[PDB]
Design a protein around this ligand. Structure first.
Ligand code: CL
Ligand code: CL
Ligand code: NA
Ligand code: NA
Lengths: 462, 462
């Protein structure tokens, strides 16, 4: 099976450089939107992430084209996915809106140019200061996640004499037990009284209901079933309360392919295979909404799908070693070829914490057979800081000729990879480079400096 | 039985405030070294960590007393555990040395006042710039982790005309994990002789001894005994073969800390939140093996977790609450779940999520009240997985039924691997840090990240 696994992985490698809209090859090197990534990693210090504005645009087009059957669709990028200002700017320039998950995310979205009417603010803990900031900035939506929080929305909107526009988050029990496993939202049974309360509030304007199914969802059925619950309650409440809702917000969760050989993958057992497309998500949602109204606005909150495929992590092979296991008589049992790169799980956190797979290739030797089994380690002083989600078990494939100094690329590294970095071991969080629409590159986030990292501390100087 | 679990947890609670060397009660509140933690969390915004210099001192005393049978012991705090400058200063002033795990860790140790001869620099990826910085600063030890890295140490020490003092890291294959497959660090035992012979010939590299590090939160003494014996046996053999006398042996870290205290109810080999050994057991195993070789040689140890783990509390305010109910198909209640939301989630206390780490949780504002209600404890991140899964019983915690929004929740034993592992996910800031000094007074030693801090790393058009 290993030889066939090796054959299959090299077929995937060839597809990257001859059949992928993002990539080419030049001088033996992987190129991204025409940019030679080996050369790029000689210009900027590794490790760093490189984002593609062209690919973000293609992803947004996929999402928007998926919703062509429903004209009144509004798309809010879930900025917890990635909020580097230059990424947010590319997303704003590509024509969609923004969902924010904290006061500082709201502020960043406003500062990069999203208008208040292009921002949704969601959360389970929206303290009075957070709500005051959001209400004062006339956000399109602030979700209502609990009755406790709603009391603060009422009080603060009254204090500011400013209308707060809200959607009530309802998390349906769609059979694993919503009460035990879903911290967010209200129960369906609480929706009516919550909406009745809001109608009576002078400065709180009820716009619709909200749900969010989850992340990297491998089937369309959960979106259909959950949307139907919220549509049925929306229809019922319009009748009971004598109102017409502005909108329904169905959240995010469109998956991204992290493994591409779907013929060999089962998305229900390995959700690195994308089980559905944006079109499947849209078909499920739109079909359920149109059983109630065709004119109502549908709000969607895609995160991962906007940026996931649109970045690469570039990391230099910085050390190598061979480790050999010997039996008790001194005979070799096996050899392990370790390659150390300058990025570990403080840089690429989900590879460790969420068992996330990313394709790994030698970008400096992209046209060479990846014919050697290796283990790939990071630089942290932690026995667990190596990449466990290999091609076969914990083993990766690289050219046997791989050399210290080569650039390794992790593909599909654009979602949930920047804000989740740490300064563990006082290794810096990475710089970030952007490829713009013209194929030109610029730095959009600096690498943390020494002074950056000590300046939060308060201590007598030396 | 849940009643017995509740009774046991409340016995543990009473032992915190009437038995534990760290804690007391006043005005119904948990006190740490006499500091009322409810009051403290009204002076500083939550969430934040509070460290105890007294408890750091007690932990260091435990470690050093454990080594009483071997006078020439040098203790290096593994600063990857916590490198806030004021914490490092407390450890420096307690009289021990520092182990560093990156160039910037070396620099901050020097800056806070550790001399070069008090610093060990360890790593698997020590780039030429890292090595030049370390060698220029006359560090007590730079470990040798690979043959590749050793070539840089030789070349750079020659260029600087400064002696690099080294210990060769050897990771034994001790049957338990397979070292070649699961241990990225160190050289094989079989490589130690030639590596040492080559160092002896280098003009500006000085061989001091061998190094190993077993692991973290180790619940048995046998791993230390077996691994130390391998390194002692090879040390003795190399002294004979090469005609040298080693300065030292470095046996690393891994002394566990109790995260659950009711040892009568635990199996440390199945649940390593129970500490399976004490510092005395660690020292007994190490010293016994070293003294079969030499009683005069220096033993270097690298404790991390044990120095600071018990010495901090995370204080976080209950900031929201809700009740979720599962209803049967007749609308009758199947069960209720009481959710309490605190202002810290796994971006603040990462190991609670990523390493399934248990920390005792109490209501510091109601510390003398029976913790008599089962609750689920959630953080503030917009992520369904951001709740604390490592409960008292399954995913459930115990708090007083009188718990109210505004109460302060404490997580105990929050001093190891809790600061540098924080993130800005959702653009929630990394926390402030307070220190209780040995006189019982408090000061801020790290600010909470500001909004400026969220964006100043980014390069964007205004
Ligand atoms: Cl839009
Ligand atoms: Cl010492
Ligand atoms: Na109203
Ligand atoms: Na020498």
């Amino acid at each position: 099976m290993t030889d066939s696994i090796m054959q299959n992985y090299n077929q995937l490698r060839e597809q990257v450089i001859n059949g992928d809209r993002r990539f080419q090859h030049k001088d033996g090197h992987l190129c991204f939107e025409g940019v030679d990534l080996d050369a790029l990693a000689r210009q900027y210090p590794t490790p760093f992430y490189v984002f593609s504005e062209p690919e973000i645009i293609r992803n947004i087009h996929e999402i928007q084209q998926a919703f062509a059957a429903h004209k009144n669709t509004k798309t809010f990028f879930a900025s917890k996915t990635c909020s580097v200002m230059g990424v947010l700017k590319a997303i704003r320039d590509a024509g969609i809106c923004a969902e924010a998950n904290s006061q500082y995310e709201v502020r960043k979205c406003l500062e990069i140019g999203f208008r208040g009417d292009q921002i949704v603010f969601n959360g389970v803990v929206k303290k009075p200061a957070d709500l005051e900031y959001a209400i004062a900035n006339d956000l399109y939506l602030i979700n209502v996640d609990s009755l406790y929080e709603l009391e603060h929305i009422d009080a603060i909107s009254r204090k500011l004499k400013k209308v707060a526009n809200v959607c009530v988050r309802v998390e349906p029990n769609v059979p694993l037990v919503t009460a035990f496993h879903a911290k967010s939202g209200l129960d369906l049974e609480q929706a009516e009284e919550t909406c009745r309360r809001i109608l009576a509030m002078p400065y709180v304007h009820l716009r619709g209901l909200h749900m969010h199914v989850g992340d990297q969802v491998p089937e369309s059925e959960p979106f259909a079933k959950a949307t139907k619950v919220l549509v049925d309650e929306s229809r019922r409440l319009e009748e009971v309360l004598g109102i017409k809702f502005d909108l329904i917000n169905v959240g995010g969760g469109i998956p991204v392919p992290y493994k591409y050989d779907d013929e060999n993958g089962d998305p229900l057992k390995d959700n690195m295979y994308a089980g559905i497309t944006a079109q499947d998500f849209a078909d499920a949602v739109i079909r359920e909404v149109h059983k109630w109204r065709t004119d109502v606005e549908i709000c969607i909150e895609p995160g991962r799908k906007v940026t996931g495929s649109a970045a690469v992590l570039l990391t230099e092979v910085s050390c190598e070693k061979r480790k050999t296991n010997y039996d008790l008589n001194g005979n070799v049992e096996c050899h392990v070829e370790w390659k150390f790169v300058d990025a570990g799980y403080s840089v690429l956190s989900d590879s460790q914490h969420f068992d996330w797979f990313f394709y790994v290739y030698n970008a400096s030797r992209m046209t060479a057979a990846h014919d050697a089994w290796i283990k790939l380690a990071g630089p942290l002083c932690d026995g667990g800081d190596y990449f466990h989600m290999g091609v076969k078990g914990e083993e990766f494939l690289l050219p046997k000729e791989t050399h210290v100094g080569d650039i390794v690329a992790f593909l599909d590294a654009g979602a949930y990879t920047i804000e989740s970095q740490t300064v563990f071991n006082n290794r810096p969080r990475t710089g970030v480079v952007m490829i713009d629409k013209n194929g030109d590159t610029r730095l959009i986030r600096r690498e943390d400096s020494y002074e950056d990292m000590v300046k939060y501390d308060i201590y007598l100087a030396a």
